[PDB]
Design an enzyme around this catalytic site. Structure first.
Site, mmCIF file in Angstrom:
data_model
loop_
_atom_site.group_PDB
_atom_site.id
_atom_site.type_symbol
_atom_site.label_atom_id
_atom_site.label_comp_id
_atom_site.label_asym_id
_atom_site.label_seq_id
_atom_site.Cartn_x
_atom_site.Cartn_y
_atom_site.Cartn_z
ATOM 1 N N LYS A 9 0.877 -1.172 0.000
ATOM 2 C CA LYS A 9 0.000 0.000 0.000
ATOM 3 C C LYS A 9 0.911 1.219 0.000
ATOM 4 O O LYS A 9 1.467 1.588 1.038
ATOM 5 C CB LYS A 9 -0.918 0.003 1.217
ATOM 6 C CG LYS A 9 -1.839 1.234 1.274
ATOM 7 C CD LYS A 9 -2.729 1.175 2.507
ATOM 8 C CE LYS A 9 -3.742 2.326 2.541
ATOM 9 N NZ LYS A 9 -3.098 3.656 2.671
ATOM 10 N N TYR A 10 1.073 1.849 -1.159
ATOM 11 C CA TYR A 10 2.208 2.731 -1.394
ATOM 12 C C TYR A 10 1.924 4.184 -1.002
ATOM 13 O O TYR A 10 0.798 4.572 -0.695
ATOM 14 C CB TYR A 10 2.615 2.651 -2.864
ATOM 15 C CG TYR A 10 3.919 3.334 -3.213
ATOM 16 C CD1 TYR A 10 5.116 2.940 -2.630
ATOM 17 C CD2 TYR A 10 3.950 4.364 -4.157
ATOM 18 C CE1 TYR A 10 6.302 3.553 -2.970
ATOM 19 C CE2 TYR A 10 5.132 4.975 -4.504
ATOM 20 C CZ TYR A 10 6.301 4.571 -3.912
ATOM 21 O OH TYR A 10 7.476 5.192 -4.265
#
Lengths: 324, 324
Positions: free
Chosen positions: B176-177
């Site tokens: 989850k960037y």
């Protein structure tokens, strides 16, 4: 409901570590508390003349102990204390319900209170923080509360109107306090709280308000408590005689002994290695064995550790200098 | 050992909340998970065509659930999923040993992986953070790992050399960037990770690197998944035809629907109310019931909630607009 009040909080309040077995840095290890060393430290602190014992803040590894380890540690502390001095455990957790569960159980074992920060996954705002402490105090009214005012760990900054609110909660009797830049105002806003400055700041704070500033917190005592005992005794005498010269000399000695502790003198870098630097300093002073750090906080740059070890040696030297 | 790899991560990956019973804001309440709503949401997400389900990040209330509640929730999700799509639980905790304990148990229940941040009481440094993920992956090699790269929650900033290291851990298959300012470089440093941009950033990221950027994460889908499904479908077509006009229109619509979410447009203020604003937005959109927030994070300024509720309405309107 607790009968502790600020009037019961005076003198040298020492924060002890949670002693580790040699394998404590290994995530495979469970039951890493050295309970023999825990009891030994408690007996020596009481015999040295400490007024109260705090535990399980940041370097106390509240974050990294298992629940079973915490229960064993507190059971041993309470059993060894035998009611001779007040004792605060530490029950900071990620949410209100787990703080309440932990606080009820540790007070039942026999702790008199909890040194309590705020949940920190999400940064708290002022009304949320106030309601958190009100919830815990109302859920566990038999527990006294020491505000663990650590902005680096807990993100929340513990501002002036927060202290005004805490003073209206009967259970909140003391605080491991900030720097003393706003201590004058916070004392006025929070009449019912014994604010504990860091031992190095106690000289200045006791001169600001000698009526209210009668106690301090110390981790340097874990390197040999005679220095903190001497500071306590000399400040008491100075408040009567007006002769602060010897209190000033002890306090200046303590600041010097702490001068190598922070990496590059940077407090935010110290905070990143708070656990390992404190425990390494204690190991080097040889008054007790703090032991290795539980994961994940078991890696400290070697040059940072040298500064902590030199601090431990300086504090051990002060313990010898002020022994009586 | 896990057989999931980045090649298995494509399309729309939706982060679901942990549905609350009406009493969930009360610290006296235990068992606050609405398991009927949990199962209903899972069935509707799979029927809408989502590619994978994430859970138990910040607004998923990983911080405020009890362990018994977490077990019940994951059991229901796994039971309802019935292996039709991959599922990541969330096992972020205050220390390495508790993360390992939780990850083993939830994978045994049937989760395929964990969306995992870093312990945050003490801010981590780079080698500590790398060793933490290596410890968990080696202790639980059957679990795939999604890096939960949230600097506001976890203090650590997840920098470039961290991504290089994660790519060398087989279990780390996705993230989850962050914002996408350094996505070009991080893709080069971390060849083995499917980086998931936020849904609003997916258009730009897929144009930067259409080979690597094939999936995104979405919380807007909890307001009605048809918009994210449409973005997925249209970006796929745009990669072949070179005609990005319709993908751009969907993406611009999503950014507009999010424009009232952050209080005063301030992301650090959004982070302080991340849980209540996300859950209030979902409640307002009416596609599912997220329910009240567990303590302590149950107080949000009313004007901030209005912005979140308007966002929920805008997203519900997009769900209708892109339904097919």
């Amino acid at each position: 409901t607790t009968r502790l009040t600020a009037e019961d909080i005076n003198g040298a309040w020492t924060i002890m570590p949670t002693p580790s077995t040699p394998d404590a840095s290994d995530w495979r290890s469970t039951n890493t508390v050295d309970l023999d060393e825990t009891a030994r430290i408690v007996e020596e602190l009481i015999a040295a003349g400490v007024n109260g014992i705090l535990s399980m803040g940041t370097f106390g590894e509240c974050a990294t102990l298992t629940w079973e380890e915490k229960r064993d540690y507190v059971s041993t502390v309470v059993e060894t204390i035998r009611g001779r001095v007040p004792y605060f455990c530490g029950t900071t957790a990620l949410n209100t319900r787990e703080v309440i569960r932990q606080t009820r159980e540790l007070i039942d074992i026999g702790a008199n209170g909890t040194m309590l920060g705020v949940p920190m996954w999400v940064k708290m705002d002022l009304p949320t923080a106030v309601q958190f402490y009100r919830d815990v105090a109302g859920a566990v009214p038999e527990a006294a509360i020491a505000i663990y005012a650590n902005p680096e760990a807990f993100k929340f900054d513990f501002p002036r109107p927060f202290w005004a609110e805490m003073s209206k909660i009967p259970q909140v009797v003391t605080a491991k306090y900030l720097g003393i830049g706003m201590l004058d105002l916070d004392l006025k806003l929070a009449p019912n709280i014994r604010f504990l400055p860091h031992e190095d700041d106690y000289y200045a704070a006791a001169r600001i308000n000698p009526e209210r500033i009668t106690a301090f917190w110390s981790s340097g005592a874990m390197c040999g408590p005679a220095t903190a005992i001497m500071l306590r005794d000399e400040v008491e005498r100075a408040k009567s005689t007006g002769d602060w010269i010897k209190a000033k000399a002890i306090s200046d000695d303590m600041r010097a002994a702490d001068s190598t502790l922070f990496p590059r003198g940077d407090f935010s870098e110290f905070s990143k290695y708070n656990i390992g630097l404190e425990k390494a300093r204690m190991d080097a002073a040889g008054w007790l064995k703090a032991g290795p750090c539980r994961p994940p906080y078991n890696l400290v740059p070697e040059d940072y550790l040298v500064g902590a070890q030199k601090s431990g040696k300086a504090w051990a030297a002060l313990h010898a200098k002020y022994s009586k």
